Short mmCIF file of C-alpha atoms in Angstrom, two decimals:
data_model
loop_
_atom_site.label_atom_id
_atom_site.label_comp_id
_atom_site.label_asym_id
_atom_site.label_seq_id
_atom_site.Cartn_x
_atom_site.Cartn_y
_atom_site.Cartn_z
CA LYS A 1 0.00 0.00 0.00
CA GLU A 2 0.98 3.55 -0.51
CA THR A 3 2.79 5.93 1.79
CA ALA A 4 1.95 9.67 1.80
CA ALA A 5 5.25 10.37 -0.01
CA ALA A 6 4.46 7.78 -2.72
CA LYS A 7 0.88 9.19 -3.10
CA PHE A 8 2.34 12.70 -3.59
CA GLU A 9 4.63 11.39 -6.39
CA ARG A 10 1.88 9.42 -8.21
CA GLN A 11 -0.57 12.32 -8.02
CA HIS A 12 1.76 15.23 -8.74
CA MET A 13 5.07 14.36 -10.38
CA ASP A 14 5.49 14.22 -14.11
CA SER A 15 9.22 14.34 -14.61
CA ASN A 16 -6.10 16.49 -23.45
CA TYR A 17 -3.15 16.01 -21.12
CA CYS A 18 -5.23 16.45 -17.94
CA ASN A 19 -7.88 13.89 -18.97
CA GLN A 20 -5.20 11.38 -19.94
CA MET A 21 -2.89 11.83 -16.93
CA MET A 22 -5.61 12.05 -14.33
CA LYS A 23 -6.81 8.66 -15.60
CA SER A 24 -3.35 7.08 -15.85
CA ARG A 25 -2.29 8.12 -12.40
CA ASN A 26 -5.50 6.64 -10.91
CA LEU A 27 -7.09 9.94 -9.87
CA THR A 28 -10.17 9.61 -12.06
CA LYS A 29 -10.70 5.90 -12.59
CA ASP A 30 -13.21 5.77 -9.74
CA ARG A 31 -14.34 9.40 -9.15
CA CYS A 32 -13.77 12.84 -10.76
CA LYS A 33 -11.22 14.77 -8.68
CA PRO A 34 -12.02 18.56 -8.94
CA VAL A 35 -8.46 19.98 -9.23
CA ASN A 36 -4.95 18.55 -9.39
CA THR A 37 -1.49 19.95 -10.22
CA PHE A 38 1.31 18.14 -12.05
CA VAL A 39 4.92 19.41 -11.75
CA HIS A 40 7.25 18.94 -14.74
CA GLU A 41 10.57 18.91 -12.85
CA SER A 42 12.84 16.08 -11.67
CA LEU A 43 11.72 14.36 -8.42
CA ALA A 44 14.95 15.31 -6.63
CA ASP A 45 14.48 19.00 -7.54
CA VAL A 46 10.96 18.94 -6.04
CA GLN A 47 12.21 17.01 -2.97
CA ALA A 48 14.86 19.78 -2.61
CA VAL A 49 12.06 22.31 -1.84
CA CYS A 50 11.67 20.81 1.69
CA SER A 51 14.87 22.67 2.73
CA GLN A 52 14.08 25.94 0.91
CA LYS A 53 11.86 28.87 2.22
CA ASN A 54 9.86 27.89 5.24
CA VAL A 55 6.35 29.35 5.29
CA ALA A 56 3.03 28.69 7.04
CA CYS A 57 0.68 26.25 5.26
CA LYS A 58 -2.94 27.48 4.49
CA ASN A 59 -4.00 25.65 7.62
CA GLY A 60 -1.61 27.65 9.80
CA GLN A 61 0.85 24.75 10.37
CA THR A 62 4.50 25.55 9.62
CA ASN A 63 5.94 22.58 7.77
CA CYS A 64 5.37 24.20 4.40
CA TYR A 65 8.14 25.33 2.09
CA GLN A 66 8.07 27.60 -0.95
CA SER A 67 10.45 27.01 -3.87
CA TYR A 68 12.98 29.71 -4.55
CA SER A 69 12.39 29.39 -8.31
CA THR A 70 9.31 28.95 -10.45
CA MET A 71 8.71 25.47 -11.85
CA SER A 72 6.78 24.23 -14.87
CA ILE A 73 3.36 23.03 -13.75
CA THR A 74 0.09 22.02 -15.38
CA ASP A 75 -3.11 22.77 -13.50
CA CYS A 76 -6.06 20.48 -14.22
CA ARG A 77 -9.52 21.82 -13.25
CA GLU A 78 -12.86 20.02 -13.76
CA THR A 79 -15.23 21.81 -16.08
CA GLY A 80 -18.66 22.83 -14.69
CA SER A 81 -20.00 20.21 -17.10
CA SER A 82 -17.97 17.23 -15.74
CA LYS A 83 -19.77 14.21 -14.25
CA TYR A 84 -18.46 10.69 -13.39
CA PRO A 85 -17.89 8.64 -15.47
CA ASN A 86 -17.21 11.36 -17.97
CA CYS A 87 -14.69 13.52 -16.06
CA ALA A 88 -13.57 16.54 -18.13
CA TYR A 89 -10.72 18.98 -17.35
CA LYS A 90 -9.43 22.26 -18.53
CA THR A 91 -5.63 22.26 -18.81
CA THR A 92 -3.63 25.39 -17.84
CA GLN A 93 0.19 25.38 -18.22
CA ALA A 94 2.19 27.91 -16.11
CA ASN A 95 5.57 28.55 -14.44
CA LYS A 96 4.94 29.06 -10.74
CA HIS A 97 6.60 28.75 -7.31
CA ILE A 98 5.24 25.67 -5.57
CA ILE A 99 4.48 25.33 -1.88
CA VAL A 100 4.61 21.83 -0.41
CA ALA A 101 4.15 20.42 3.11
CA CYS A 102 6.97 18.12 4.20
CA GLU A 103 7.17 15.27 6.72
CA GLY A 104 9.18 12.23 7.58
CA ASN A 105 12.80 11.29 7.57
CA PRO A 106 13.87 11.74 4.88
CA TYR A 107 11.94 15.01 4.93
CA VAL A 108 9.94 14.83 1.72
CA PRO A 109 6.84 16.49 0.15
CA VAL A 110 3.63 14.80 1.25
CA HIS A 111 1.07 17.50 0.18
CA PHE A 112 0.91 20.16 -2.53
CA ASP A 113 -0.26 23.27 -0.67
CA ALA A 114 -0.34 25.83 -3.56
CA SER A 115 1.37 27.45 -6.55
CA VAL A 116 2.20 31.30 -6.57
#
């Protein structure tokens, strides 16, 4: 079974596109997930964000970290028309700073908090 670090990688790393990848990574085989972000950078460069700028997470906890640089990301958002089984997504490509929450030893991303 899947750890939180492994779930982060399957759902968000990728070292229309959203419809295809949401299905392949098992996000939409059994439900339609409203939003998801994929990061087009190497896994080790995203893991490196856990020792970069420490910030508060949306929830007020402090194990969040903001990347110094922008990274290539694709945002996938369900259309207002989407309904399981027919999930449908609008694909937006952008270069943004990511914010991830980190836990464990090794201290690795376990949640994608935001892009800015």
